[PDB]
Design a protein around this ligand. Structure first.
Ligand SMILES: NC(=O)c1ccc[n+]([C@@H]2O[C@H](COP(=O)([O-])OP(=O)(O)OC[C@H]3O[C@@H](n4cnc5c(N)ncnc54)[C@H](O)[C@@H]3O)[C@@H](O)[C@H]2O)c1
Ligand SMILES: NC(=O)c1ccc[n+]([C@@H]2O[C@H](COP(=O)([O-])OP(=O)(O)OC[C@H]3O[C@@H](n4cnc5c(N)ncnc54)[C@H](O)[C@@H]3O)[C@@H](O)[C@H]2O)c1
Ligand SMILES: NC(=O)c1ccc[n+]([C@@H]2O[C@H](COP(=O)([O-])OP(=O)(O)OC[C@H]3O[C@@H](n4cnc5c(N)ncnc54)[C@H](O)[C@@H]3O)[C@@H](O)[C@H]2O)c1
Ligand SMILES: NC(=O)c1ccc[n+]([C@@H]2O[C@H](COP(=O)([O-])OP(=O)(O)OC[C@H]3O[C@@H](n4cnc5c(N)ncnc54)[C@H](O)[C@@H]3O)[C@@H](O)[C@H]2O)c1
Lengths: 267, 267, 272, 268
C-alpha cells in the first residue's frame, strides 16, 4: 500500500537526525521509497551514512552545490545506482551569520551572492543536472519560510532568497509541467535544526510561533516530513507550483493572539 | 497503515459519484475511515444511500443547511451512532443560476443572501453544532475555488462567497486551534460535477484550465479526493488555516501559456 | 491643478468629523471636487449637514443602505442636482456588537446576513443604482481592513465581509472597466471612529498597530483621506481592482517588531 | 506649487524619454521637486543630460550599480550639491537577453548573479549609501512586475529577482521606518521602453495585457509616473512596504477575459 513503493528519490540536505531533509526521507522510506543522499563534506558524511543506512540506502554522494564539478558525478552516480528518479528533495540553504544579525541595509554583496547562489540557484542547477533522469509524474520539492513574503525578525537576506526561491518554484512548475513533472515548496514553521542553531536568538522566533500559532504549538519534524512525503507522492499529483504551509497555522495570523495578548500571559 | 483507521468522519455534500465529496469520501474510505453521510433531501437521498452502502456506512442523515431544524437532530444522530467525530467534509455551495450569468452588478439581494448563507454561513453553523463532538486532532475541510481571489468568468457572487469562505477558514482555525482542531480549505480546479454542469461558462473555463495549467491537464476526482484525505488525516497535523490548491498548478499562471504563440491559439 | 477640479462625487458614510468618509471628502474638496453627501437618518443628518456646508456642498440626501426604497430617490436626487458622477466613496459597514466579540463560531445567522448586506451588498446596490450616471473615467472606492485576509483579534464576521468586499472590487472592476470606470479598495489601518468605538477590543488593536508598524505610528485621518483622493483622482487612472494599504506599513509584518541590541532581539511590545 | 515643492529627489534609471524613470521624474517635476539624475555610462549620459535639463536639473552623476567605486562619489556629489534627499527612485534592472529566452532551467550561474546583483542588491547598496542624507519622511521607490508572484512568459530569472526585490522592499520598510522613511514598489503593467523592447516576448505580452485588462488598455507613461509621484510624495505618508499595481487592473485576472462564452482574444 505504501504511496512511494518502487519510487526512487534523491535527498539533498541531511546534516543529522534533526534535518528537515531527514524527516522527509524517513516519511518517504516508511512509504516504500528507494532513497539516495548527498552530503556537503566529510564531517557530515559520517552523519549522513548511518542515517541513509537506517533507511536501507548505501547510495551516498558528495555534493557541495557551490562546486559545479560535483554535479556531473552526481548525475553519473544516480544514473548507475538508481537508473532514474521519481522525486528530488532540495533541502539546502545558507547565508553567513553576520547577514542575519543587524539589518538588511547592512548586507554585503558577497553575503547576498552566497545566500542567493546556495539557497536559490542550487535548485536550478540541481534540477537541470538531473532532469534527463526524471520519470513521468516526478515531483521536485524545496523548502521555504514565511520570511519570503512577510517581514520576520532578521531573516533579512534569506527572506530575499526564499522569495526568489518561491518564484523559481512557479517558473520551474511551468518549465517541467509539460513533462508531467511537479515542483512545490514546503513552507515550514520554525524548527530546531543545525542551521537553526546558527541564527542568534532563534529561540525567540520559535517561542513567538509557539504562543501565537492557531494550534499553540511548534511543528514537529515528523509533521514536516509527512507533508513533504505527501507533496513528493502521487497523492499530490494534482498539486504543482504550490507553497504549502506546515507551520501549525501561524501564517494566518495578522497580529499576536489574544484571550489580553497570549504573549503577555506568557509574560 | 491506513492513515484514517479508527477515524470517524461526516461527509456533507455527496450528490452522485462525480461529487467532490464523493472523491474525498472514497479516498478516506480506502484509508480505513468510518464514514457518515448527509443528504440534501429525499431526491438526493436516493443517490447518497447507495454511495454510503458502497463505502460501508449505515449512517445517512438529512441536512439542508438552510433549515435550522436539521442541525440538532444531526448532532443527536452523530452522537448516538458514532459518539464523536475526527473530521468533517464541508462540500456544499449554491447560487441562483441567473446570478452566475452576466454581471455581479445585477445580483439581487435575495440571491446574494442565498449564496452567502448556503456557501459560507453553513460552515459556521455545521461546525458550531458538531463542535462538542470533535475529538482532539479533528480536521474540518471545506472546498473553495480560485474565483475567490482572482476574477474568473461570470463567477460573480460565488467569488464573493468563496472569498468569505477562505476568511472563515482562517478565523475558525484560530477559534478551534485552542483544542488542537484544524480547519482548512481545498481549492480545486474546475471539474465536471452536477453543480458545475449547471453553469454555461463551465466547458470553456474547464478548457482554459486544461490548455494553460502547468501540467496541461484538468484535475481528476481522485486527485481532489486524495488531497482532501491528506488534509483530513494526521499526515497534515501541522497544517491549518490553509487554502490548498489542487488545480494542476493553474493558480501560478499570470497570463495564457505560450510556446511566441499562445497555446490557446494552437488549439 | 487640483486633481479633482470640476469632478463630481458622492460621499456615502460620513457620521462625524472623525469618519474616514470625512477625511476622504476633505482631501477631495481640497483638490477641487464638487461633493454630495448621504446620511443614515435624521440623527446623523444633524452632523452631516454642517460637514457638507463646511466642504461647500448643499447636496445632502438620506440613504439607509438596508432600505431598497431609498435607492431610486437617491438616483433621482443626484441626477437632478449634479447631472452625473465622476466618483463614489462607499464608506459604510456594520455588524452587531455581539458578533465582533467572542468567536466566529457563535455568530448568529441574522448577524451574519446583516454584516454581509450592510458591508458588502450595499456596494453592489449603490453602484448598480448610480451606474447610469457614472461618467467615462469615473472611480468607485470602498474601504477595507487587513482582517479580510489575515486573522485580526475578534474581527470575526467582519473579516468575512471584508474578504467578500475585496472580491467584489475585483469583479466590479471587470464589469465596469469596459466603460473606463475604475473600482478600488482602500485598506486602512485602525483609526478611532464612531464605529471603532463600539468594539470593546479596539484600543488594544490600535496600540498593537502603533507599536509594531514599520513607521511606529498609527495612520492619521489625513493620510487615509489623501490616499482615497489619490484613488479617486485621475492620477490613479492606471489603477483598478487594487486593495491599497494605508496603514503605516503594518501589512508587511509577519510577527511583532523587535529592537536589535547585542545580536539579541527584544519585542518592542515587551519594552512597552 | 505641488506636493513635492522644495523636495529633493534622486532619479536612478533614466535611459531616454521613454524610461519609466523619466515619466516618474516628469510627474515629480510638475509637483515642484528639485531633481538630480544618474546615468550608466557616457553613452547614456548623452540622453540623461538633456532630460535633466528640460527638468531644470544641473545635477547629473555617473552610477554603474555594478561598480561600487561609484557609490561614495555619488554620496559626495549629492551631499555637496543638494545637502539631503527627500526621495529616491530606483528604476534599474538587467538580465542577459539569453536568460529571458527559453526556460529558467537553462539559466547560467553568471546570468543569475548578474540579474540578482543589478536588479536587487543595487537597491540595498544605493539606499545604504544614501541613508545619512535621507531626511525624515523620505520615500524610496523601486519598480517591479507581476512576474515576481505569477508566471509570466519567459520572464524567468527576472521573476526571481523581482520576487526578491519585493521582499527587500518589505525588510527595508521595517529597517527605515524607525526614521519615518518609507519604501515601496510600483508594479507596472508592460510598457514599451528600451529595456523591454529588447525582449522577443514583449509585443505579445503588451497585446495580451491590453485585451484582457479590466480597463481594456495598456498603461501610459504618465499613468506610471503619476502613481510613482504619489508614492514619493507626502500624499502617501501612511503607505510603506506596498507593492502598488499600475497596470489597468490586469493583476486581478485569473484567466482570459470573456464575452457573451467567448474569449476577447478570439474576437481579436
Ligand atoms: N526553522 C527551520 O529550521 C526551517 C524553517 C523553514 C525552512 N527551512 C529550510 O529547510 C531547509 C533545510 O534546513 P534545515 O532547517 O533542515 O537545517 P539543516 O542544517 O539540517 O539542513 C541544511 C542543509 O544544507 C546543507 N548545505 C549548506 N550549504 C550547502 C552547500 N553548499 N552544498 C550542499 N549542502 C549545503 C547543509 O550541509 C545541511 O545538510 C533549508 O532550505 C531551510 O531554509 C528551515
Ligand atoms: N469545478 C468544480 O466542480 C469545483 C471547483 C472548485 C470548488 N468547488 C466546490 O466544491 C463543492 C462541492 O461541489 P461539487 O462541484 O462537488 O458539486 P456537487 O453538485 O456534486 O455537490 C454540491 C453539493 O451541494 C449540495 N447542496 C446545495 N445546496 C445545499 C443545501 N442548502 N444544503 C445542503 N447541501 C446542499 C448539493 O446537494 C450537492 O450535494 C462546492 O463548495 C463547490 O463550490 C467545485
Ligand atoms: N476605523 C477603522 O479602524 C477602519 C479600518 C479600516 C477600514 N474601515 C472601514 O471604513 C468604513 C467607514 O467606517 P469608519 O471607521 O469611518 O466609521 P464611521 O462610523 O465614522 O463610519 C461608518 C458609517 O457607516 C454608516 N452606516 C452604517 N450602517 C448604515 C446603513 N445601514 N446605511 C447607511 N449608512 C450606514 C454609519 O452611519 C457611518 O456613517 C467602514 O467600511 C469600515 O469598515 C475602518
Ligand atoms: N517596461 C516595462 O514594461 C516594465 C514593467 C514593470 C517594471 N519594469 C521595471 O522598471 C524599471 C526601469 O526599466 P524601464 O522599463 O524603464 O526601462 P529602461 O531601459 O528605460 O530603464 C532601465 C534602466 O536600467 C539601467 N541600468 C541597467 N543596468 C545598469 C547598471 N549596471 N547600472 C546602472 N543602471 C543600469 C539602464 O541604463 C536604464 O536606465 C526596471 O526595474 C524594470 O524591471 C519595467
Amino acid at each position: 500500500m505504501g504511496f512511494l513503493k518502487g519510487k526512487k528519490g534523491l535527498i539533498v540536505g541531511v546534516a543529522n537526525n534533526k534535518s528537515i531533509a531527514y524527516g522527509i526521507a524517513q516519511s518517504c522510506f516508511n512509504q516504500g521509497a528507494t532513497l539516495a543522499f548527498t552530503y556537503l563534506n566529510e564531517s557530515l558524511e559520517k552523519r549522513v551514512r548511518p542515517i541513509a543506512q537506517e533507511l536501507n540506502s548505501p547510495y551516498v554522494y558528495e555534493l557541495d552545490v557551490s562546486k559545479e564539478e560535483h554535479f556531473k558525478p552526481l548525475y553519473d552516480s544516480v544514473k548507475k545506482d538508481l537508473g532514474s528518479l521519481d522525486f528530488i528533495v532540495h533541502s539546502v540553504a545558507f547565508a553567513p551569520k553576520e547577514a542575519l544579525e543587524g539589518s538588511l541595509l547592512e548586507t554585503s554583496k558577497s553575503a547576498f551572492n552566497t545566500a542567493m547562489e546556495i539557497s536559490v540557484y542550487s535548485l536550478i542547477e540541481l534540477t537541470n543536472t538531473l532532469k534527463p533522469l526524471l520519470n513521468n509524474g516526478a515531483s521536485v520539492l524545496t523548502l521555504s519560510y514565511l520570511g519570503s513574503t512577510k517581514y520576520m525578525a532578521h531573516y533579512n537576506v534569506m527572506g530575499l532568497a526564499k522569495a526568489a526561491l518561491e518564484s523559481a518554484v512557479r517558473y520551474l512548475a511551468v518549465d517541467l509541467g509539460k513533462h508531467n513533472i511537479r515542483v512545490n515548496a514546503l513552507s515550514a514553521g520554525p524548527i530546531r535544526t543545525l542551521a537553526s542553531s546558527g541564527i542568534a536568538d532563534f529561540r525567540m522566533i520559535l517561542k513567538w510561533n509557539e504562543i501565537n500559532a492557531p494550534l499553540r504549538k511548534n511543528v514537529s519534524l515528523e509533521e514536516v516530513g509527512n507533508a513533504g512525503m505527501y507533496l513528493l507522492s502521487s497523492l499530490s499529483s494534482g498539486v504543482s507550483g504550490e507553497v504549502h504551509f506546515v507551520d501549525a497555522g501561524y501564517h494566518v495570523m495578522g497580529m499576536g493572539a489574544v484571550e489580553t495578548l497570549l504573549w503577555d500571559l506568557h509574560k
